[PDB]
Symmetry: none
Subunit: 174 residues, 2 copies
């Protein structure tokens, strides 16, 4: 009832290595508590610095990843229209896209051959990066590049919600 | 003292058996919450590394951003006030190799007579911006305090078109 609980306090209290009375085993208790009280309060004050540092770290990712208008304007995203698509012989991954920006016709290469059929591409309004650097592929020049979104399993080209005249430049204005 | 110091345990936690039994609970609780702090004290060890890596990255990012700016000394060749505007000055500037044209908004703070001839620091790479009829290839550095506008000039004399460099 009482002595067992005081004896229990003896178990939780660290090794005394000293007399086993009743008051002594109770004295250490208020000592133990007071110390633990001090520790947690010092640790609790420390945690506030960690959170203050937590946000501070995040806020530094924003700063380092910030885009800016002018940097963005250097990237020219425009809606295109597919004219034809043919599978490349000797490759089960590449498709040669013929695109229409209204005025300029472009030749792009895409890896969606497994995920996309030429028949379903013709007529589709896909978004591309026109400015993007040509990378010679299979002895063929890929003028501009195609935007994609991949989970690894699922491949997806990008499309405007409504239909729009081919060639429209994507803006972030208002 | 036994009862009085037990009573002290009453002031500790925010009937003799009740608070005694309420003490072991406070103990067991504290014996857990402290065991966590030792992990959170090692958590904040990794967050110390994070701040370290990001700053050095920002530092490198900061230095890289500076070298993008090609600060070059130019020499005013002409200065004529723009017509219909009381704030603009079209300035022809020799850099020693090619004479660029630059508009400056320092009309109210300067006379063309006092200006012409002085070797001033400008921003070279700055994109050419057309300002009502003139194609300014770069822009000039001017300090403003609200009371005084001041163009920027090297302390000693140096060859025109010199590349203003910071140390590193």
């Amino acid at each position: 009832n009482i002595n067992d609980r005081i004896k229990e306090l003896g178990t939780l209290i660290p090794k005394s290595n000293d007399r086993w009375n009743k008051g002594t085993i109770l004295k250490a208790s208020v000592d133990y508590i007071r110390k633990l009280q001090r520790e947690q309060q010092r640790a609790k004050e420390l945690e506030n610095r960690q959170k203050k540092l937590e946000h501070a770290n995040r806020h530094l990712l924003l700063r380092i990843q910030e885009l800016g208008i002018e940097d963005f304007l250097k990237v020219d995203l425009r809606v295109a229209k597919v004219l034809s698509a043919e599978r490349v012989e000797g490759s089960e991954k590449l498709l040669k896209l013929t695109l229409s920006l209204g005025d300029e016709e472009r030749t792009v290469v895409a890896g969606i051959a497994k995920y996309y059929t030429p028949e379903e591409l013709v007529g589709k309004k896909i978004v591309i990066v026109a400015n993007l650097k040509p990378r010679k592929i299979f002895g063929i020049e890929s003028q501009g590049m195609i935007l994609a979104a991949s989970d690894g399993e699922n491949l997806s080209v990008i499309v405007p919600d409504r239909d729009v005249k081919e060639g429209a430049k994507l803006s972030a204005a208002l």
